Design a protein around this nucleic acid. Structure first.
Length: 88
DNA sequence: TGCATCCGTGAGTCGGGTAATAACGGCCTGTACGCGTCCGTTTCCGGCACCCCAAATGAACCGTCCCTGGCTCCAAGGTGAACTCTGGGCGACGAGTGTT
């Protein structure tokens, strides 16, 4: 929003925003690397037909990306239950 | 600095075809198909303006392809006689033969 129709942002008001942006992206990454184990545990079951183990794993990884992007913590549910549907 | 440890080529010649998984509503659209209507086309019914067109209806008609007329000038049918066989008619002569 500040890019066009903004203000000459001072350093105190710019560096903090940049830092929190990087922090959020890093936290997202961290959750993904945490839950790849759930991804592989789910994808182990669909083997033996069509495509290979690693292809299934990477498709589950894409599904996990989608699940994290569309997750909602306010609902007070464990993340695994929501992510399983998207992985599948 | 060997040294095991893979590691990369053989090794010839002309009956067919064999299987798995949670997935389920709900919205969009898109290309193909299915309705109703209108207009160019086109194609013929019968009309001329007449275009005339013509095979069919009167002549001659003249050469010619048929009739009738007379005339021969001859070669075939009718009129002879003989004759050389053609055939019958006449006659004599001779042995194989009916008989006591």
């Amino acid at each position: 929003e500040l890019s066009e129709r903004g203000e000459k942002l001072p350093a105190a008001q710019r560096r903090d925003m940049m830092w929190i942006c990087r922090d959020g992206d890093r936290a997202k990454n961290h959750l993904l690397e945490a839950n790849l184990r759930l991804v592989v545990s789910l994808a182990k079951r669909y083997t033996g037909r069509g495509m290979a183990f690693l292809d299934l794993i990477q498709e589950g990884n894409l599904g996990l990306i989608r699940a994290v992007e569309k997750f909602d913590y306010t609902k007070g549910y464990k993340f695994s239950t929501y992510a399983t549907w998207w992985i599948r």
